[PDB]
Structure 1
Amino acid sequence: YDKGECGAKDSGSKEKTSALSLSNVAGVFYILVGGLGLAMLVALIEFCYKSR
């Protein structure tokens, strides 16, 4: 231990965090764009399925 070359028991960096980042939240954008896709898919029907 007393000629060791690493923090053998305590190494707490306790950092100012790296802020929240897009890697943590991207799932919400992933669902959002799919919701817009479904919206257009139904919009191509709602007003015009009775066309003849």
Structure 2
Amino acid sequence: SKEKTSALSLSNVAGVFYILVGGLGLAMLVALIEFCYKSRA
């Protein structure tokens, strides 16, 4: 019967920030390799 009013901690949505930054560096990877190919062609 003793249930609590608990806010979400950062651990609950923790991986969403991880796949945010992983999605950021992937776009950093693509923004490099799209300018390099047009500079070759």
* Structure 1 residues without counterparts, runs of 5 or longer: 1-12
So what's the TM-score if we normalise by structure 1? 0.61
Gaps of 5+ in 2: none
- Higher relative CO (Cα under 8 Å, sequence separation at least 6) belongs to 1
How many residues in Structure 1 have an aligned counterpart in Structure 2? 40
Instruction: Give the root-mean-square deviation of aligned CA atoms.
Output: 1.7
Which runs of 4 or more aligned residues in structure 1 lie more than 3 Å from their structure 2 counterparts after TM superposition?
A: none
Higher share of residues assigned helix? 2
Q: Identity percentage over the alignment?
A: 100
